[PDB]
Amino acid sequence: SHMCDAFVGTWKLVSSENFDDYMKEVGVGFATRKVAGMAKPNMIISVNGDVITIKSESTFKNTEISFILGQEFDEVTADDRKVKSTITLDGGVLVHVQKWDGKSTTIKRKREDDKLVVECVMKGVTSTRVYERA
Numbered sequence: 001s002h003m004c005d006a007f008v009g010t011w012k013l014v015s016s017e018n019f020d021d022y023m024k025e026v027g028v029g030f031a032t033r034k035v036a037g038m039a040k041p042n043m044i045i046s047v048n049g050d051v052i053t054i055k056s057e058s059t060f061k062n063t064e065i066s067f068i069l070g071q072e073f074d075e076v077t078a079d080d081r082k083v084k085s086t087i088t089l090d091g092g093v094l095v096h097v098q099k100w101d102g103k104s105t106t107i108k109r110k111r112e113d114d115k116l117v118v119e120c121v122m123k124g125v126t127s128t129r130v131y132e133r134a
């Protein structure tokens with residue numbers, strides 16, 4: 001057993017707050033915000049050795065990233081940003097930092113009760129999204 005066991009599995013979005021405002025702060029345009037905000041993704045998290053894979057499946061986009069903790073990678077986000085990402089585990093929280101164009105946003109994922117809580121932060125704006133097991 002290991003590092004991310006309590007994250008592994010298939011998760012479905014159950015609630016969202018402030019996500020449109022977070023996307024505005026990131027610079028996402030109107031049409032993408034509307035369709036991405038309407039998405040109800042399933043997030044599939046798996047681990048094979050040191051490699052973690054996070055898939056997000058929705059009617060808007062299907063994305064997949066694989067990474068090793070602490071080891072930067074290039075990512076194309078669902079909103080079509082080309083970012084440099086680093087994901088670490090900090091006190092049991094997965095911390096995903098994306099850098100692009102001199103900007104930075106952080107996505108934190110943590111287990112709380114039977115939920116996986118996703119917090120997206122861009123400057124002063126936070127969005128909180130709650131997933132439950134599928």
Ligand SMILES: Cc1ccc(S(=O)(=O)NC(=O)N[C@@H]2C[C@H]3C[C@@H]2[C@@H]2CCC[C@H]32)cc1
Nearest residue numbers: 036039041056058060077078079118120129
């Ligand atoms: C389509 C969709 C998939 C997942 C979420 S999420 O907010 O639940 N998880 C993320 O991983 N968020 C990231 C914060 C930026 C990047 C990614 C998300 C894609 C659109 C812009 C946000 C929200 C929408």
